[PDB]
Enzyme design. Structure first.
Site, short mmCIF file in Angstrom:
data_model
loop_
_atom_site.label_atom_id
_atom_site.label_comp_id
_atom_site.label_asym_id
_atom_site.label_seq_id
_atom_site.Cartn_x
_atom_site.Cartn_y
_atom_site.Cartn_z
N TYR A 127 0.84 -1.19 0.00
CA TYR A 127 0.00 0.00 0.00
C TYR A 127 0.87 1.25 0.00
O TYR A 127 1.98 1.24 0.53
CB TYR A 127 -0.93 0.04 1.22
N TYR A 143 -10.14 3.00 -2.59
CA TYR A 143 -10.62 3.34 -3.93
C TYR A 143 -11.91 4.14 -3.95
O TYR A 143 -12.00 5.12 -4.68
CB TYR A 143 -10.76 2.09 -4.81
N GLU A 185 -0.60 -2.01 -8.04
CA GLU A 185 -1.44 -3.04 -8.64
C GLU A 185 -0.73 -3.79 -9.75
O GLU A 185 -0.96 -4.99 -9.93
CB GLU A 185 -2.75 -2.45 -9.16
N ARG A 213 1.64 -6.35 -8.21
CA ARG A 213 0.95 -7.50 -7.64
C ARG A 213 0.44 -8.45 -8.69
O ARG A 213 0.54 -9.67 -8.54
CB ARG A 213 -0.21 -7.05 -6.74
N1 LIG Z 1 -2.38 3.21 -0.50
C1 LIG Z 1 -3.14 2.38 -1.23
N2 LIG Z 1 -4.44 2.63 -1.35
C2 LIG Z 1 -5.06 1.69 -2.10
N3 LIG Z 1 -6.39 1.67 -2.41
C3 LIG Z 1 -6.59 0.55 -3.18
N4 LIG Z 1 -5.50 -0.13 -3.38
C4 LIG Z 1 -4.52 0.58 -2.71
C5 LIG Z 1 -3.13 0.34 -2.58
O1 LIG Z 1 -2.46 -0.60 -3.05
N5 LIG Z 1 -2.51 1.31 -1.81
#
Ligand SMILES: Nc1nc2[nH]cnc2c(=O)[nH]1
Length: 262
Positions: A72, A123, A176, A179
């Site tokens: 993240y 999201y 993304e 991954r």
């Molecule tokens: N920081 C962060 N927010 C997200 N929101 C959805 N996917 C992600 C991610 O991989 N990182």
């Protein structure tokens, strides 16, 4: 804490591919893997973070701070004013992690300025800030990523919509893509143009944790229970074995416990 640099202003599908490969090898746990798929480390392992320096056109740079455990984005920094380092921490980051983002992104205490991101990284939050019903309505692309870096980097003040659009594109093209091999492929196939994420890339993003747990728990290549995903056309896609989903997955979320390594 290592930094991975990627020049958005001038690259090729091969350089993008090398970038994601470096990030995957940097993020992954040296020893953890299930069914040949490398797994992210435990929250305990050091380093805990990985930086991604994005070099855009017009000497505009933005560095993204990523948590290795789940990839993240915790926040980003940009060169500000003369020699000031402006750090932007996500609203959902708290505790000691907020100090880590501050000191890891801008290691010089005497010259760092802050500009918090007044919203979380989910999201749906990003999509509402960006003013859309779905991120599928926001086009992804190398030139789009380069263009957003220019709207943020060094800029005194920008709208939350402009910041959200940047985050939506950067997260999907960096986190993304690292991954999922599938999402990396979608980028490379549409490398010279802007594209809208199809139902499969969005579904893949939203069920990553479930897929990671399923694969980790699968016995003899058979998932604990039928996994209901969505294919590129938007139709239901039922997966029963690891072989069926493995091709689209590059990294597994950290899942405690043992699993069949290969
Ligand atoms: N920081 C962060 N927010 C997200 N929101 C959805 N996917 C992600 C991610 O991989 N990182």
């Amino acid at each position: 804490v290592n930094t991975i640099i990627y020049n958005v202003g001038s690259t090729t599908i091969s350089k993008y591919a090398t970038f994601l490969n470096d990030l995957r090898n940097e993020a992954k746990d040296p020893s953890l893997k299930c069914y040949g798929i490398p797994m992210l480390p435990n929250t305990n392992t050091n380093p805990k973070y990985v930086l991604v320096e994005l070099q855009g056109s017009n000497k505009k740079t933005i560095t993204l701070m990523l948590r290795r455990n789940n990839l993240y984005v915790m926040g980003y920094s940009d060169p500000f004013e003369t020699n000031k380092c402006r750090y932007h921490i996500f609203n959902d980051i708290s505790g000691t992690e907020r100090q880590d983002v501050e000191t890891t992104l801008c290691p010089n205490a005497n010259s760092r300025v802050s500009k918090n991101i007044n919203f979380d990284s989910r999201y749906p939050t990003l999509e509402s800030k960006a003013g859309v019903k779905s991120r599928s309505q926001v086009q992804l692309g190398i030139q789009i990523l380069d263009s957003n870096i220019g709207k943020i980097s060094g800029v005194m003040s920008f709208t939350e919509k402009t910041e959200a659009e940047f985050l939506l594109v950067a997260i999907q093209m960096v986190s993304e893509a690292a991954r999922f091999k599938y999402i990396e492929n979608q980028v490379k196939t549409n490398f010279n143009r802007a594209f809208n994420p199809n139902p499969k890339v969005l579904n893949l993003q939203e069920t990553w944790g479930k897929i990671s747990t399923a694969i980790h728990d699968a016995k003899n290549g058979v998932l604990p229970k039928p996994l209901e995903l969505v294919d590129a056309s938007g139709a239901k896609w039922i997966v029963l074995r690891v072989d069926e989903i493995k091709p689209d997955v590059a990294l597994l979320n950290y899942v405690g416990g043992s699993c069949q390594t290969t």
